[PDB]
Amino acid sequence: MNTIAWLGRLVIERIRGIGVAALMLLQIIFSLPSAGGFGRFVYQMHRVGVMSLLIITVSGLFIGLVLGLQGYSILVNVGSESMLGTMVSLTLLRELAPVVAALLFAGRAGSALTAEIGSMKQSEQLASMEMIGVDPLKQIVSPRLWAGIVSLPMLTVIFAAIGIVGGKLVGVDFLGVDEGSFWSGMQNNVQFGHDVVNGIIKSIVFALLCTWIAVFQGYACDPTPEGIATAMTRTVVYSSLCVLGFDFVLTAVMFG
Amino acid sequence: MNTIAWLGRLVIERIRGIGVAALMLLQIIFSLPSAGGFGRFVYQMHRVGVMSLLIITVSGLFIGLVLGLQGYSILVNVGSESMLGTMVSLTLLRELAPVVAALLFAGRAGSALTAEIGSMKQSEQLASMEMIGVDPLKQIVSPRLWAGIVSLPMLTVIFAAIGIVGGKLVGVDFLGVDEGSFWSGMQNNVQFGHDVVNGIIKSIVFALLCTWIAVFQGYACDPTPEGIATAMTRTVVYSSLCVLGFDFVLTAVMFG
Amino acid sequence: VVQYLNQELVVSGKIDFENAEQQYQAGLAIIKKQTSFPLIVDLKQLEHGNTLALAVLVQWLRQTPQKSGLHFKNVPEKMLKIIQACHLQEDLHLV
Amino acid sequence: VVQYLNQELVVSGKIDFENAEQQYQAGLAIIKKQTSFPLIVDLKQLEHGNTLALAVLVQWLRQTPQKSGLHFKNVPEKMLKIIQACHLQEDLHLV
Amino acid sequence: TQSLIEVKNLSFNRGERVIYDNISLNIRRGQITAIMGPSGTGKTTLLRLIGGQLVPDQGEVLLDGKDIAQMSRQELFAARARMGMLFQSGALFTDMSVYENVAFPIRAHTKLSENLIAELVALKLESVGLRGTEQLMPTELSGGMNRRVALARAIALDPDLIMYDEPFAGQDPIVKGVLTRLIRSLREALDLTTIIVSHDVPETLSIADYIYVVAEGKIQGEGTPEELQAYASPFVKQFLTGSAEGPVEYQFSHQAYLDNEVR
Amino acid sequence: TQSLIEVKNLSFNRGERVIYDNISLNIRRGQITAIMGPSGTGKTTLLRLIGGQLVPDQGEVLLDGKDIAQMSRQELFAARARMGMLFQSGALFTDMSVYENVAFPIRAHTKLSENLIAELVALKLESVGLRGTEQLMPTELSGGMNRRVALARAIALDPDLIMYDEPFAGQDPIVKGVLTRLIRSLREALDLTTIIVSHDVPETLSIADYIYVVAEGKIQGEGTPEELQAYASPFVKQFLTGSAEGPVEYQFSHQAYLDNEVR
C-alpha cells in the first residue's frame, strides 16, 4: 500500500501548491505601483507580446485555410454555401480563436516566462535583489503578469482577423463562391456584442490562467539546472488543461 | 543596414540547421538494430506514451462536451439535429483529433524529450558514453524516436473515442435528442477507410515531425543551463507550426 | 552640512546621501565668482568622508577651467586612503 | 589460457576478457572431484594479471567448502599489489 | 574590539532537518572572520540569516542592540543599507548593463542626480579596476571580470559588513591572486568587516583573523589561527590537514566482505 | 621511458577561433603528466583530441605508431578499451543504478556471464571504497561519493591511460584529501599513465612529474617541477605565483581618469 500512499502524498502537495499561488496573486494586484513601474511594463510588452506576433499571425492563416477547405466540402452536398462565410466566422470568433491562440501562447510566451524567472532563481539574482531592499515580486514578477493579461486579448483579435481573411482566400478566390454573398452572410448572422465581445471576455479569463501559472512555476522552482526544465513542462501542461477546462464552463454560460 | 544583415544571418543558420537534422534522421533509420534494442523501446514507450495518457483522455472529454454543446445551438435553428451525431464525429475524426492531440503531445511529451536529451548533453553523459565506444545515437536517441512515432497514433484514437462518447453525453443525455437517431446518423455518413484511416495517416505524419524536431533540439543544444530552456521553447513553437502547416496540405489531398 | 567661503572654502559637517545635493551646488556657484583659480580647498572639518564626499569633490574640479583650478589640503587621514584606492593622486594636488 | 592439475592446479598463460569464461569453469569442475581441501594454488606462470584474473580466482573460493579451501602461493610480484589495493589479504592465505 | 553581529542560540529547520541546533557567533568589528566546514551544511544559509532574509526559529540576530526581525519596514530598509553581499556565482543582473548594475543600490536607496551617480559608479568601478567598461552587458564579460563587477555593486554604498561567499571557487591562480588582494585592500582602506565562507585551508589560515568551523550544527572549534591548530579537536585536526584518521570515515560499510554474496 | 601519446603539430578551429595553433606534447609511460593554464582555453578539448572524439585539422595523434583517425571502426573500438576518462562533473548515467554504471564498460566491450561481471564490479567498487552501495540510483549519492563512483567506471577495464579532468574543483579538504590519495595509489598499483588537467598550484606541483602550461595556443613552459620554476618564463612566473606583474594585466583600460567625461 505504498503506491496509494505515494499517490495521496502527490495530490496533497499539489493542493497546497495552489494555495501558495493564490496568496502570491493577492500580493501583486493589491498594491499601488512603485515609481518607474510603467517604464518596465512597456518593455515587457515587447518580450511577451511583440515576439509572439509572428507565430500567431502565421498559424492563424493555416487554420483559416483549413476551415474554408473543410466547410466547403460539407456545405456543397447540401448545396447551401451562402452560409460558408457564417460558419467560418462563427467557428473562429466564439470558439477556435479564444482556444487555439491560448494553446500557442502557453508554449511560446507562456513557458518562456518560466525559464526567465526560473533562471533568475537558480543564479541567485532574486535573493541578491532582496538584500538591497527591492522586493522582487513588485520589481520583476509584476511587470510580467500585467504584460500577459494585456498581450493575449490583443492577439486573439489578430488571430481571428487573419483567420477570416485566410478563409476568404480559399473560399472565394480559389474554390469559386460569390464574394458578395460571402460578406453579406456575415452581417446577418454575426452580431458584435454577442459574438466578438464574448470572444474577448473568453480570452481575458484565459490570459489570467496562462500567466499566473507561468509566473508561479518560475518563482517557486527548486534551484537546479534540471529542476528548471521540469517546471517548464509543468506550465505547458497545466495551462492547456485550464484553457480547455474553462472553455466548457464559459461556453455553457455564454451560449446556453 | 545592420538589422537587415542580422536578419539574413538568422535565417541562414536556421536553413543549415535543417540540413543537420535531415542527416541525423538518415543515420537513425538506416541501421539494423543493436542487441538489446527492443528492451529499451518498451521502456521508452512508458515515459512518452503512458505518462501522456492522463492529459489526452481528460482534455479529449472537454472538447467533446464543447462540440456537442455548440453543434446543438446551431442545428436547432434549422431544426435538423439528426445530423448532430454526424458533425460531432466528423469534426473529430478528420480534423480536430489529428490536430489538437498533436498540439498537446508537443507540449507534454514533445518538450520533455528535449529536456531529457538536453540535460544529458550539458552534464557530459553523451560525451562519456562515446569514449566507451557506445554510439549515443543508437543507444539513447533511437529508442526515443521510435517511441514517438508509435505512441501518438495510439493516442489520437483514444482522443477521438473519448471525444465522441463525451459528445454523446451532453447531446443525448442532457439536451435530449434521440439516442437511436444519434448512432444511426453516424453509420450512414461516416465511412471507415475514408475517415478513420485518413485520420490515422494524418497523425503518423504529425508524429514524425513532433518527434524528429523534439529530438534534434535536445541533441544539438549548446551545453548551458539556460541554453537548454531556450531550446525547449524552440521545440514547442516549431512543432505547432509544422502541425498546422502540414494540416492544410494533407486536408487538400485527402478531402479535395 | 554647511560650507563657507571667506577666502578659502572649507567643507564642514558630514556628506552622506541626504545632504549631497545642495552641498554640491552651493559650492558650484562659488567657482564662477572666483577667477584666476586661487580656490584651494582646506577641507579639514570633515569627520566621516565616505567616497561620496570624494564624488562631489571631483565634480567641482570637472567644471573648473583646464583641469586643476584648485588644490586640496589637510586631508582628514582617511580621504586620502580613498584616493590611493581609486589611484587618483596623480590627479589631485594633495601637496 | 590453459591450466592443469597433476596434484596442484597451476594457472598458465594470460587471463583477459576473451579466455575468462572457459578458464573459470574448467577450474570449477576440478574443485568437486577433490575432497578434504588440499587444492592449494601455485599460480606462477601468469604474466599479465589484470584484476580479472583476481575476479575468477575469488569466484573459485566462493563455491568451496565453508569459505576457504584454497591457499595461494608464489604470486607473480603484481597480483598481490592488486590484493592490498582491494584490502583482501586478511582473506587469502598468501603465506 | 566590539562585536557588530552577535548570533545567540538560534535554530533553523527546513522540514524535519536540523541546521544549526545551538550556535553562538561573534563578528568583531574591523576584523576578517572566516566560516569553514564541509559542503552540504548550511554555510551560505548562515549568511542569509545574518543578512536577514530567512527567519530564525529559536533565536535572535543582534545588530548593535536591535534584533533584525523586530525592525520595522523602514528600519530594515535602513539597516540593509549597511550590508553587502558577494554571492557564490557573482549574481549579476543579466538583463541590464554594467553601469545599471552598480547604480542599482544607489537608485534604490538614495535620491541623487545623474551627474553624481555617474561619477560614483566611475569611482566604484575604478577601485576594482574596471573603469573602461561601463556600457556592455554582462555577457562578453569574462569569468574573471564577472566577480569583480559584483564586488563593485556590493560595495557601492560603503557598508560596514560585506560577506564574501566563496570568492575563489575553481578559479585560475592569477584571478585568485587578484581577488585575494582586493579583499585585503578594500577592507583596510574603508574600515569594513568581512566574512569569508570558503573551504580552502592555505589562504583561509593566512587571510582570516578568527575562524569558526561548523560541521553538523555546532562549532567544532574557534579562535585565532595560532590556537586553532594548537587546540586541534579530532574533527578540526582532520579538516585542516585532510587526513585519513578521525570521525569521518573512508569506507562506506565495514561488513568484512565475504559476508556479502554477489547474487 | 617511452611516450604513449605523441601529439605532433595539430590545429583545432571552432569557427574563426584559434585553439592550439601549433603544439607538440609527449605523454611518457607510467608518469603523471599535468596540463595547466587559464580558464577558457581548450584544456578539456585537449583531452577529447587525445581521446579521439573531436577531430584535428592539421596534425596527428600518435598512439604507438598508429594515428587515431586512420583506425578502422573495429580498431578504434579496440583502442578505446585502453582509455579511461573521469570528467569535470562526474558524468554518471542518472537513469540507471550504480551497479549498472560500473558494468557499462564491461558489457559494451566483453561478453561474460553475470557471476563474473557482478564479481568484477564488486572488486572495482571495493578498490575505490564503496563496496556496500551497489543498488541505489545516483541521486541520494553525496557529492563526495559521486566522483568516486565515476572513477570506478573509468577504471573498470584496467586501461593504461586515465585522464582526470579537474578532480577537485571546489571540494572540501577531506574529499580533496581522499581523491589525492586514490590518484597516487591506483596509478602505482596498476601501472597507469595519468593526465591531470587542473588549476591548483599546491597539489599540481606536488603530484605531477611533468607539467605543460598552455596559455593561448602554445606552450609557455614545460619540464619537471624543479626546472619549471627555475626556467620561469614571464608568463609562467606570474601563473605559478599569482603576482600582479607580467603580460596579463590588472586594469581594463588606461586613460588616467580625466580623459573620460561621464555624460
Ligand SMILES: Nc1ncnc2c1ncn2[C@@H]1O[C@H](COP(=O)(O)OP(=O)(O)OP(=O)(O)O)[C@@H](O)[C@H]1O
Ligand atoms: N530551496 C531549497 N529547498 C529545500 N532545501 C534546500 C533548498 N536550498 C538548500 N537546501 C538544503 O539546505 C542545505 C543548505 O546548505 P547550502 O547548500 O545552502 O550551503 P552550501 O553547501 O555551503 O552552499 P554553497 O556551497 O553555495 O555556499 C543544503 O543541504 C540543501 O540541501
Ligand SMILES: Nc1ncnc2c1ncn2[C@@H]1O[C@H](COP(=O)(O)OP(=O)(O)OP(=O)(O)O)[C@@H](O)[C@H]1O
Ligand atoms: N559546444 C560549443 N560550441 C561552440 N564553442 C564551444 C563549445 N564548447 C566550448 N566552446 C568554446 O571552446 C573553448 C573550449 O574551452 P573549454 O571550456 O572546453 O575548456 P575549459 O574552460 O578548460 O573547460 P573545463 O573548465 O570544463 O575543463 C571555450 O572557450 C568555449 O567557449
